[PDB]
Task: structure prediction
Amino acid sequence: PTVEELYRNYGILADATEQVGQHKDAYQVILDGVKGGTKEKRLAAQFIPKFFKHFPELADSAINAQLDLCEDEDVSIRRQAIKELPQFATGENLPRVADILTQLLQTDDSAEFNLVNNALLSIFKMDAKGTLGGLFSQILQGEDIVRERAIKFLSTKLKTLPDEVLTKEVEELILTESKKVLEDVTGEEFVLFMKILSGLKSLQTVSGRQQLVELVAEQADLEQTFNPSDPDCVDRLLQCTRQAVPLFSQNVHSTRFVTYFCEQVLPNLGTLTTPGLDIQLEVLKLLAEMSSFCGDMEKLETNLRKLFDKLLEYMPLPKLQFSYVECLLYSFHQLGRKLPDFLTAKAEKLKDFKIRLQYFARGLQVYIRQLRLALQGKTGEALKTEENKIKVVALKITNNINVLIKDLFPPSYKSTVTLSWKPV
Result:
């Protein structure tokens, strides 16, 4: 088992060209290479895959030898052997190879990691479904560490594949397997699977997004009742509904999340958490984004009601909570469009509305004046001061409220504001 003899046998197999089949003996010498030392194992790792395709009568022995090198104590030997694994992924071996590579994702050596990723991508281009089979078997049946690595592989790598590879049938398989996985995922996995799925070209259509919204709803579990007490319910609902927001459009509606949020959430605030972002604002920002995408609500009036009431808790009677009011007012304004007959229809609580508005509008100016004063002469770099950024943002907030009040006057639902924390 020597390097001189490995080189000599390599030469024999290379120079034979057409007749390589007639030299099983030299190939055997090469496979014996794996029992040697470092330099010899390093050669076997290159030489076994190179001629593999010529010796079917030796195929199993070949893969087994390469796999021994893939679990070598020496990381550089493993690396050389892993780089070449896709060359064995021919005939009926691709599933077995795809399985091994997926395990190897757990390596902590970064160069190894990179090689394993690239090998997966290679076999992916040879046979996507066989490769996905390996990946998803591990995700479903393998060790936690492997399951995590496998999901991050789908999460980060599919996008680096050309469209040619990601056929309609492959995307269908990615959805089918994902739904199996989604029967039982942590929230962090959920987020990864939503990114994976929404990236699929076939799930980027109207019905594609409609399907995706339905998975979020299932995950979120909109038939449970809401418990404002423990966090096991709170951040899990927001993390979930967060994934649906980007899916919503004029044709893909938020109806169910809106209804749930109104009926089962607003009443429940504000019970809290630490820690240091404001959890009630987060909830209210979420509601306002989905509100513009609401469809035909069954429980419309009763819903618009609980919303109207949460509003008045922040628009007092003759220090204002502006950010909160931007959200609620925006939402109410979005849902009113559908039932103008509200307000017209309903009480003498409607003059108790006007009073609360007149008074807010008053406090608006003051605040707006103070902001515009603090901001003037300020030079564009000075605007970026995290302190000035907030002031700029607060002008969008306050000015947005003013437009919405100027609309709720025969009331109008004509005006369109861009939520302060959003781009145009």
In short: Residues 1-424 form one domain. The first helix runs from residue 3 to 15. Residues 135 and 290 are 35 Å apart (CA to CA).
